[PDB]
Amino acid sequence: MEIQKKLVDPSKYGTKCPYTMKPKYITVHNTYNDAPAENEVSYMISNNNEVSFHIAVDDKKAIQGIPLERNAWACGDGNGSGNRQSISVEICYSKSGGDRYYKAEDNAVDVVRQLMSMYNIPIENVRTHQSWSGKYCPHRMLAEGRWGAFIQKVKNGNVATTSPT
Ligand SMILES: [Zn+2]
């Protein structure tokens, strides 16, 4: 999966990621609304709002907006774990639920494994927004029992042993 780079401006760092920290975990979220990942990033990096994320992936494209060598306020967990040292991945089109979501999820898989490989994050550190504080973000994944599946998919790169064929 190809990641786009339109990372946030240094002047916006201290509203999206004022601190610098190395990510040890990964936090996956599902989108409650449908939009291309590029839309989410363009919006998020320019926001004044506390909540930020690193990489957004949709069915079409994957775009990263917050530098991974910095924090991301995502969980509202303050200084606990993910807000400080996790990678926030936002799956776009989760609201759309259908084909756009299925690709977006599959695309996140490929993206997420890269972080596990590069930053040395075990699949055991991939957590939900609820796993830190309790905001239900991966709604689709949690409700349909697709979280564990996603996690196994990320483990290898989509075609891990979790899809019976
Ligand atoms: Zn969230």
CB atoms within 10 A of CB 135: 14
d(CA 76, CA 88): 12
Domain CATH code at residue 98: 3.40.80.10
**17 burial level (CB within 10 Å; 0-12, 13-18, 19+):** buried
Q: Which helix (H) or strand (E) holds 143?
A: helix 139-143
User: In angstroms, how far is the first alpha carbon of the chain from the final one?
Assistant: 23
The CA 151 to ligand 1 mean position distance, Å, reads: 17
CA angle 14, 18, 22 (to 5 degrees): 150
Say what angle helices 99-118 and 147-156 make with each other, to 10 degrees. Answer: 50
Q: What sign has the CA pseudo-torsion 91, 92, 98, 103? A: negative
3-state secondary structure of 67: coil
Phi, psi of 26 (to 5 degrees): -140, 130
Of the candidates 73, 69, 90, the one whose C-alpha atom is nearest the C-alpha of residue 82 is: 73
Which residues span the domain enclosing 105? Answer: 1-165
Contact 56, 42 (CB under 8 A): no
Phi, psi of 98 (to 5 degrees): -80, -145
The CA 130 to ligand 1 mean position distance, Å, reads: 8
The CA 95 to ligand 1 mean position distance, Å, reads: 14
Structural domain count of the chain = 1
The CA 88 to ligand 1 mean position distance, Å, reads: 8
88: which 2 tokens? 């926030």
The CA 91 to ligand 1 mean position distance, Å, reads: 10
The CA 165 to ligand 1 mean position distance, Å, reads: 32
The CA 144 to ligand 1 mean position distance, Å, reads: 18
